[PDB]
Structures are given as structure tokens and as C-alpha cells.
Design a protein around this ligand. Sequence first.
Ligand SMILES: O=C(NC[C@@H]1CCOC1)c1ccc(NC(=O)N2Cc3ccccc3C2)cc1
Ligand SMILES: O=C(NC[C@@H]1CCOC1)c1ccc(NC(=O)N2Cc3ccccc3C2)cc1
Lengths: 464, 464
Amino acid sequence: FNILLATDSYKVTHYKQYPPNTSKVYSYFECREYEETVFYGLQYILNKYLKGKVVTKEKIQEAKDVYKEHFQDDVFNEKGWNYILEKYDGHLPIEIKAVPEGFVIPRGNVLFTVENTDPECYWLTNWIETILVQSWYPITVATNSREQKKILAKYLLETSGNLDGLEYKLHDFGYRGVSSQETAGIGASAHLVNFKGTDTVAGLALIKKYYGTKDPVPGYSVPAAEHSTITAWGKDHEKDAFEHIVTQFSSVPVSVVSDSYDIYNACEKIWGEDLRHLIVSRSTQAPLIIRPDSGNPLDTVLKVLEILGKKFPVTENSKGYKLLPPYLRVIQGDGVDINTLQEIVEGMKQKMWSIENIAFGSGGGLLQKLTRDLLNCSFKCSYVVTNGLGINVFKDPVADPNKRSKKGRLSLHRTPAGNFVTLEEGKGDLEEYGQDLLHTVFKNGKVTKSYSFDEIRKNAQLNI
Amino acid sequence: FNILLATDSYKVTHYKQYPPNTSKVYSYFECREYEETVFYGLQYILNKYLKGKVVTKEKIQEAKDVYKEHFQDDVFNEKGWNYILEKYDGHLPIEIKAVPEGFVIPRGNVLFTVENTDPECYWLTNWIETILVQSWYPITVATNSREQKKILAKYLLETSGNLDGLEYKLHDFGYRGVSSQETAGIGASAHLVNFKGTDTVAGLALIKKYYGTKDPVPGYSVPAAEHSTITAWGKDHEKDAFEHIVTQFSSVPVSVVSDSYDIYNACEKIWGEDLRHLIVSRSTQAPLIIRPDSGNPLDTVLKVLEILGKKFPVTENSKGYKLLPPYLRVIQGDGVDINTLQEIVEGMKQKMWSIENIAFGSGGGLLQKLTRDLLNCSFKCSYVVTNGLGINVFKDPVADPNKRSKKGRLSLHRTPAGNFVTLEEGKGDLEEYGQDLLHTVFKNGKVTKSYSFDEIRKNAQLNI
Ligand SMILES: O=C(NC[C@@H]1CCOC1)c1ccc(NC(=O)N2Cc3ccccc3C2)cc1
Ligand SMILES: O=C(NC[C@@H]1CCOC1)c1ccc(NC(=O)N2Cc3ccccc3C2)cc1
């Protein structure tokens, strides 16, 4: 990795564009005015990409050669980068202040600030905008995952009277549906801030190395079938495939994809009649989890439940909702996103089915179908010192008031009613509010403050 | 990187689910049913993750320890992975056949096939589905980028009499808007299959290391301003910022963001009057590129052009379309995706503005706002050998005929009219359609066929 080649190309030319005699460039990140966001992911970026000796004579030469060809011109700040290598042994003269990870903050508040600690390195603040702005991704995954936990919590509490098994009800199926191995690890770790069920194993190594848990692992899985594992038996032997799989995993929960040919036939005739004897004997700690994987997600879930309810002994819980026997559950793992999860739980509640009957598997909807536009994650310069005088800077485009940026030095505070407020123009210096919630997390090539994954989970908890 | 921890968790349990005495699992990839797709990205995955010694005693132990805790059970195939380490010095006994990279293939055709070359490793074919299915991302970026090139080519040919500068008209601004550094390099490289303009620096190193070009670099950029380099001068000094930037880059093209406060005032009064003398003197090889970055993308482009048309000497080209002087161009870099690019070029053509006047910058729309569902990229088992007998395997869900998979051994052929056909059930063995278009690209830990980035570009060319 070469930090000199890890920026938007045009940033290579910005050192020549700032006002002459600029000694400070101060910038901030916010999710411009999903009412609240989970702040998560910065610690990973700081350790993997920004800390320690990030500049070497070889990295400077490599960048110089690439940029000469890329711009067809010598525009690269070799002097500037050589200064960092010589004065600081290649350590970044930058200070980053951030809200603690796992913190749940309303939209439109400062989440982190960046500034150079050496006047010569005024250009460095925004050089690293590209790498830091990528924090949008774990923030958005964590936020969108927490918003789904709120929906699940609400419906589980309404239909069952409690939150038992809430943290296993949204399972990450997104490993293949994501853009890269690195995204897989980041995205899966962000979902684990809220839940404990994952098949995206890449998330486990990321948490272990960069955050850490008291428990051996942050997430769990159960054996489950795939279409290859069912269809390999041949179309006439679906019942043999099912019998073999449930017999191999007789003492643990086992998920079995049942839509290879006809989901409704598999539920009614195969599980409900032919193999019913192998299901009703299962332990409560080892249910069969039937998995449909096609069709309209709500219509399929409802039809599968109506079939199962007629083949298996259903009870009515204390809330008046229908509950399958404990050795039998359902998992909807196709086309689940925040909108369809809401339609399913609401449709189940309308048909008097408890949310304890189901779990959801989400792939692309959980880790890939998200953009930087969803929470309007943006990094902008708000303060500069030129000719020794500090000036409050901002953008305010005439056609879009939503793109107006904050002015001056910023601080994040608790209001008297316990909400959040971002003070602008260095007004945090007046001791009118409590202490600034932004803490130094990075300074001069060193990570100064770290959070464990356990602290992050605690910070990200739902109120209920 | 540990390939034993680079799969969906449930795949760890599949070796116990296949019919006993299975010696072969044969699977394929397709973009089920954007009528045609650019096949690109497999070579990167083969080299970075699949080739050479991918199994060690340490990797086996690491995976064993993680899975023991992750499943709260021992289900990990330690014996199977030890067999690969001992028999093949940790090299994967797998054969992968693929269509040449850069090839443009209609939807619903076999793109690549995977099979084990050792009977003991029947479970390996689908273990690596997760890593290979991630090919969806460079395929979709390359395809969506090529679809945008088709729109640009059509309107540029209609409004001017040619395609001059086509490969510089869609510039990648997506570095900050992607989910990770790895995604940035993959995605930017896929856009470079069709275009030559990029700010996502990460793409260059990927192409150099994994594909290669005759030219020193596959993509180019020009100096450009950002809001921080304009706004740092203070709200009353936007003219001073502009004058300094264009004087610093007087002999190369320079992009200048002009919407910090009022885009229309900046075009009419600042560029159009105050600084007009510094613009009209610029070389044809060094235009000023005005950059709006807010408001309705089409309305803003049209109003900016109407303003410039009244302040600068506009000509009428041979097709009857309006053309700015050669020292002046526009770049629309906000909210550009395939839909808005289409609306802008059509809106410009309706107002008699040539497409030579504009270039587009696309961030999230080009590299992030894409999912595996867009081209229905899917990997499925189509053939197995059990007890020495080959059987044609497929899924055919009752509620979704679109999810029905192909049967048996597959081959890709040219039809008599020069189109494509995927033959199923080993029918390629009949010499009725000539030779199979898939080639062995990987066999037993080695990459057996590779393509340069220049061959890929040639294969991906538009007919026009
Ligand atoms: O219900 C479940 N959990 C809640 C509780 C926990 C203890 O049991 C109840 C459950 C858990 C996992 C699964 N996994 C699968 O179905 N996969 C995994 C995966 C990955 C990628 C693609 C496809 C698939 C199919 C299913 C149900
Ligand atoms: O017009 C252009 N090219 C066509 C021809 C080629 C030779 O010159 C004409 C052109 C090229 C680059 C740019 N770059 C920018 O505006 N950036 C870069 C970037 C990155 C990330 C976020 C924001 C921005 C703003 C502008 C215009």
C-alpha cells in the first residue's frame, strides 16, 4: 500500500491551489441532514492505512513516476512528501478527533475532524479525504443494520412479549454479493455491531485484529444447505438429500433450502409427511430451519407458514400469536432489504404469526445496496489559517441549501435535554455546554485512543 | 489471506451433504436472462487468491480454531484440506474454463466453469463459489460503463460528425464513494476497459500488476479544484482563487469547481467578465473546464451553457450544433449515472448544443450503485458424478422460472449467424456447432491462459 497513490488524482494538484501563506487546513466529516447514524469504522482505517511510517524514499519515487505519466506533467509535490519523510520519519503530521465508535448521533453533526499539526503540511489534511470518506461504508452498513434491528425488535416485542433471539434474527448472507474481499470484511464487521449471526467469515478476522472481543468470536453460524447440495442427488431424490442432511446435523440447528423444485410440495409432502418423523423428534436447541429462496418474499413466507401450521402442532402464545413447535423454524434469505423485512414482519403480524417463527438472511440488501448518498456522508474544509489569521470557510451552493457546509472550528456537545449539538465558529470555547464529545484518536502517526468491539456494541445498543 | 476463511460459513458444512461416492462437482457462472455483458475480472481473482500454494499447516490450524468457535462445533473438513496440502503442496486441484476477458456476451450464457480434478476434492468446486462470484463486480462495472459509452458515442456522432475524445468523456470520480480500497482498484480498472479518464489512482496499479498495458499507464487525469481550494480563499475572494488556479495551470487543461456560492454568477460575472481575458488567451490543448456541482443536473448544464454562449464566441459546427471556443469546456460531475447521462445528452441535443462541449464525472453511479442483481450473476452446480455415473443437475423453482439453472456439461459456441449459444447436457461433444469458446484459464494451482489489458480493451470495443 502506498498512501501517495491512495487519493483522488486531482488532490495531487491542490497544494498549488490553496491561498499562499496557508498554515492550517481544518476539515470535518458529517452525515448531512435514517435520523441517526452509528459511528463505526474509523479505527480500522487509522491502523491499516494511516499510522506509522507511511512515507519512504521508494514510495515517493513510485508516486512521482506514476503521476508523471498519469498527468503527462510533473505536478506532484515531491518536496512536501520529502519533508514528512525527513522531519517525521514518514509519520503523518495530522490530528484526527472523533466521536467514540458505536456512538449513535443524529444527522447533521460533526463525527470527526482532521487538521495538519505542521504549517508546511497544510495540503495533507485534504490529501487523506478520499481514504477517510470511505468510512461512509461501515457507518452506513452499521446504521442500516441497526434500523432493521429496530423493526425486528418492535414486531418481536409486539407478537411475543420479549426480545429473545433478536441478535440472531438478521443473518449476513452477503459475502458473494459484495464488490471485494476487503469490503466483505468491513461490511460484515459493521453488521456485527448489531447482530451475532453471520456467514461472512471475513468479518471475524477484521474484528479480532483491529477491535477485539472478550468472546473467542463476534459472530456465529449454523450448518445450512445450498442448491448444489440438494440438486446433486438428482431431481427424483430431493427427499433423500433432505433426510441425509437432517441426519448428518441431528444435534445442531440446520437450515435446509427447500425451493429447488417446488417449495410448497417440499413443505407439505416431504417435510410435512414423508420426513415428519425426523423433524418432530428434534431438540429445541437443534431445530430444522426451512429455507424458501424464490418467489414474492411476503407471499412465500405466508404460504409456507400456512402449510406448516396445518402439518405441525401450532400453539398460541400469550399475545394471541401462532407459534410453530420449537423443533421447526423458517428463514427467508432471498430479496431481504430494510423495505421487504418491514413488509414481511407486518404481513406476518396481520396473519397472526409470531416473529419468533422466522429469521432473515440478507445479502446485497445488507452489504452492497448502499451508497454514500444514503446518509449524505461528506468531508469539507471549515477552517483555515492564512497569514496567521484564522478564517471560517464553507460552501453554500445557490441551487442546493442541503449542500451548505458548517463554518469554523467545530465541537460536538450534549444539550441540556440530552440531545446533540454541533457548535460552529469555535463557539465550543465558551464553556456554555459540557465537554466536547470528539476525542483525539490519531496524532502524528500514532493511534491515540482505541475502542474494543465490546464497547462499540454497548454504545450502539437500542433503547428498548 | 486464508482461502479456508474466504467462503460463506455454510460451505464449511457442505462436504457432509453431497451424495456419498461423489467424485465430481461441476459448476458454472452466468449473467442470467443490459442485453450483453463485458466479461472482465476473473484474471485478478485467479492471481491474487487462487494460484500457487494457498494451503499451509498454519492456515488449516487457524481455520480449525475459528470454525470451532464460529459453529460451536467441529464440522470443519481438516482431513480434506490436509489432503490438498500433502498431495498437491497446497495447490488447488481445480480446473476453470472461461470466455476470453473483454468478450461481450449476451445474457444467459456460460461465462466460466469450475470442476475438481481429484475425486477426493469434489467439495472444493463450490467452496470457491464465494470468491469467484465476486467477479460480478468488475463484470457489472465494465458492462454499465460500456453502456454509457454507447450513449455518449451515439450523441457525440449525431451532434459532431465523429467520436473524437470519446474515451475521455466519462471520468471516474468514484474513489471516495466506494466501499473499500480493494473495490476502488477493481472498479476503477473495470471502467478503464472502456475509457481513459480516471481519478481513482488505485486502478492503475491493479492493471499494471495483473493485466498490463503497452502504454506506461491505462488512465489519465488533469488538474482540478475542489471546494476546499476555492472556499479557503474566503467567500469574498472566489475571483482570486479562480485567477490563481488558472495561472498555476496555464499550459494544461484545468477543471474549476464554480458552484461554491453561485454557479450562474461565477459563469456570467467571474469567468464571463472579470477573468475572461485569462480564458480567451488559453491554448486548445489547455482549456478551462467549468465544473457545476449542484442543482438539477440537466437544468444546470443548460443554464451554464446559455450563460457561456452569451459571454464567449460560440460557433456552429458542420452538423448545425453550437460549439464553445476550444479554450472552454464544461464537466458535469454531480449525480451522474446511466439515467442522468442520457437525460443530459438528450437535453443538450434538443437545445442544439454539441456533446463535444461536455464531459461527465461519475462517482457512486459508476462504481458503487451496482448490485449482483443488476445482471443476475449466478454460480450453480450443473453436473455431478456419483458412483461413477454422471448426472445432469439443475434447480427449477416453481415460483420463479427466471431462477431455473442450466443442465449438464456446458460449452459456449458461435451460431451460423455469428451469435452465441450455450450448449447443455454435454451436447458440445457433437461437432454440430464447432469448437467451444471457453478456454482453460486455471488448472491445478496454475494460471494457464492470461490476457493483456490491451487485448481486453480491443475485445470490449463498440461496433461503431
Ligand atoms: O435461523 C437461523 N438463525 C436464527 C437461529 C440461530 C439458531 O437457529 C435459529 C439461520 C442461520 C443461518 C442460516 N444460514 C443459511 O440458511 N444459509 C447461509 C447462507 C449464506 C450465504 C448464502 C446462502 C445461505 C444459506 C439459516 C438460518
Ligand atoms: O473535461 C475533462 N476531461 C475531458 C478532456 C480530457 C482533457 O481535457 C478535457 C475533465 C477531466 C477531469 C476532471 N476532474 C475534476 O473535475 N475533478 C476530479 C474529481 C475526482 C473526484 C471528485 C471530484 C473531482 C473533480 C474534470 C474534467
